[PDB]
Structure formats: C-alpha cells, structure tokens
C-alpha cells in the first residue's frame, strides 16, 4: 500500500480525480475543508490516496502530509490562465520540503475537455517542470468529467513506482 | 440518496446483533414514507435532512466488527460536512448540550487505547476534524475541547505513523480553525458595543 497526495489549488479537480479513480464514476463536490482519504485500486495496486482541500487558507497545512509520500498527483486547472503562477509558485515550494525528496511527482493538466485550455507543453513550461532537480516526473493532458486521460496518467505512475532502489 | 445504499450495506455484516439490524431497518422504512451516485446528495430541503434518522449510525460506532465502525465515521463525515447534519435542540439527554454535541461524543467513544483499529483511528480522526471546521455547525466548547482530547489520545497512543502525521495535522487544524472562530466572535463583541 502506498501513499499519494492529490494537491492544488481549489477547484482545480482534485476530488472528482479521486472519486473517479475511485469507483469510475464523476460525482458531484464541494469544497474539502479538512480532508478525505480513500483507498484506490489500479492495476492490481493499491493506494491510500487523500485528498486535501485547496482554498487559499487551507494550503499551509499541506506540508503536514507530506510525511511517508511515494507520489504526488498535483492537479492544475488548465483554464485557470489567472493563477498558474500560483500553481507553480506553491509547487516549487512544496518539492523543497526534504520528505518529499524521494516522491514522484505527476501533473495533471485537468479540464483538458475545455476550449479554453492551455497546451500540455504551455503548461510544463509554465510550472518549470523542465528545471527540475532530481524528479521522476511527468505531465498528463487529462479530464476527470469524461475520464480522459486518466488511465494513461495511471499506468506511467503505477510503472514509475515500480522502479526501487 | 447515499443513505438508503449504505443502510443496506449497514444490515449486511452480522445480524448477531439483532437490536441493530431492526434500528437499522425502522430508519430505512421512515425514509421510504418520507419519499412517498452512492457518496451523500446535496444541502437542498427538496431532500429530506437526515436528524434523528442517526440512531442507526451510533450502533455502528458502538458495533465490534471495527469495519463497520470505520464505514459509520466514515459516511457520517461525508454528510456532516455536506451541511446534512445540522443538528437540534437536546435529545435523550440534558440540554446544554445540542444533538450535534451527542454525535461527536459518540465519535470520540470509538477509540478506547492503543488497542483500537487503526482503520477506525483514522477515521475518527478525519469525522473528528471536518466536524469541528465545518462552515456550517457550531459547538459546545467542551465538546470542542473532547474532540481536540481524542484526536490528542491517538496521537500519543497510536502505533500507526500514519494516523500519528495525521493527527498531529488535524490538531493544528482543528485549534486554529476554533481559535479564529473565537478571535471574530470576539472583535463583532468589540465593535457591536461601538
Ligand atoms: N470541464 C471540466 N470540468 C471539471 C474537470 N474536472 C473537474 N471539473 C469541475 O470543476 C470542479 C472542480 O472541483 P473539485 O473536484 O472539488 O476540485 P478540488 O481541487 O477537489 O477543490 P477543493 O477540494 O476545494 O480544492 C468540479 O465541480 C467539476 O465539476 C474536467 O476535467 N473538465
Ligand atoms: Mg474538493
């Protein structure tokens, strides 16, 4: 069993991921405050995946949980052509902290579905996934509403994971 | 809608326990005659709030088999912090004290030492926590400060690393969430005389 955070900021579409990681299905959400925890089975592996809400006040604590992380599904909102500084900025931060120093880190570019939607490599650039030190990471155009993307996004994961010193 | 789903669910386990296989069925029969995806629905008052429709639930806390206990803390987190479990005036009890104040307590009775299920740890943990920050409830500030006590006991006497990180996490949550509460309560006091 292993231990993933799906992080970003509100509304980015962290819980519909879960719960249509989950049991296959979109449903409808609010706002976590707090968190929910959830244990997911793909490929025959399983995680406890928690989810952690995003609203401006609420992310300090994200460093709380970063403690025993094997992977970080990091959802950003594709259309959110406003905060991606944000998303990067919180993202940087975050891949500082020394418990996360050996996570794997996956970026969903969510909402892919939507007109409005930056490029896969728009957003890559965006975040500066490329300057990243020492990271195991790749970047997922993905809908979480019409179960785009998700499975390939899994399987790099599930197939990373699989990679032990 | 998820209530009617994880009722039957509810009846499934064991039956060992009659008392709570009936309380279990009487709640479900009220929900048919009050209608006359499986996560909880929506706030609205078109779906009929879920009060005393409870009873069934504090068995399931109360129940041995700990996989029913973690499926109890479980849903009634869910729905609470949907804004389904306002909570009313004392039942069964001596006022000075909501039903919401009842329901904690009773989440907060699950974990009894080390011994517990971690399953169940957790989840207490985490009812334990979008109970105290939910938008939506108030609460007894005893009943605030047993909460903060139990999440407290599995942080100290856990065993599990995990729900000890987690914990440890939602006992800054939770103080920093009731302390805020208090700190604009407080200034509405000082500006309200004004
Ligand atoms: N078009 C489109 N809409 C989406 C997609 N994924 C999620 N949404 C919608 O956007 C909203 C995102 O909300 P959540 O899934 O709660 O996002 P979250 O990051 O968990 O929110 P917090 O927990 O408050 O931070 C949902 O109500 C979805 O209806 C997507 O891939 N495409
Ligand atoms: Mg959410």
Redesign the interface.
């Given at each position: 069993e292993m231990?993933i955070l799906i992080l970003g900021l509100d509304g980015a579409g962290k819980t519909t991921i879960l719960?249509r990681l989950q049991?296959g299905?979109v449903?409808?959400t609010?706002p976590t405050?707090?968190?929910?925890?959830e244990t997911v089975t793909y490929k025959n592996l399983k995680f406890?995946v928690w989810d952690l809400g995003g609203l401006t006040s609420?992310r300090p604590?994200w460093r709380?949980?970063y403690?025993?992380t094997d992977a970080v599904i990091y959802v950003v909102d594709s259309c959110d052509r406003d905060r991606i500084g944000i998303s990067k900025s919180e993202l940087v931060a975050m891949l500082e902290e020394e418990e996360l120093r050996k996570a794997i880190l996956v970026v969903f570019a969510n909402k892919q579905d939507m007109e409005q939607a930056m490029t896969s490599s728009e957003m890559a650039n965006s975040l500066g996934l490329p300057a990243l030190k020492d990271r195991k990471w790749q970047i997922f155009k993905t809908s979480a509403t019409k179960g785009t993307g998700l499975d390939e996004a899994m399987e790099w994961l599930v197939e990373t994971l699989k990679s032990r010193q | 809608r998820a209530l009617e789903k994880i009722l039957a669910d509810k009846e499934v386990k064991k039956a060992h326990h009659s008392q709570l296989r009936k309380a279990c069925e009487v709640a479900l029969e009220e929900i048919k005659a009050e209608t006359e995806?499986?996560?909880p629905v929506?706030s609205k008052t078109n779906f009929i709030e879920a009060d005393k429709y409870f009873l069934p639930f504090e068995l399931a806390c109360q129940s041995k088999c700990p996989r029913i206990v973690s499926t109890s803390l479980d849903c009634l987190q869910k729905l609470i912090?949907?804004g389904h479990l306002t909570g009313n005036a004392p039942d069964s009890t001596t006022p000075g004290k909501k039903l919401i104040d009842r329901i904690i307590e009773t989440i907060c009775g699950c974990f009894q030492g080390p011994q517990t299920d971690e399953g169940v740890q957790?989840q207490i943990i985490?009812a334990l926590?979008?109970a105290v920050?939910?938008?939506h409830i108030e609460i007894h500030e005893g009943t605030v400060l047993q909460a903060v006590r139990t999440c407290y006991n599995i942080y100290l006497a856990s065993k599990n690393?995990?729900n000890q990180?987690?914990a440890?996490?939602?006992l800054?949550?939770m103080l920093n969430v009731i302390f805020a509460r208090m700190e604009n309560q407080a200034l509405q006091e000082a500006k309200q005389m004004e």
């Open positions: 231990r719960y049991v299905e449903v409808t609010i405050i707090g968190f929910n925890v406890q609420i604590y709380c949980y403690s025993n | 995806t499986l996560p929506k912090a949907y957790l985490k926590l979008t920050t939910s938008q690393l995990i990180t987690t440890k996490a939602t800054t949550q």
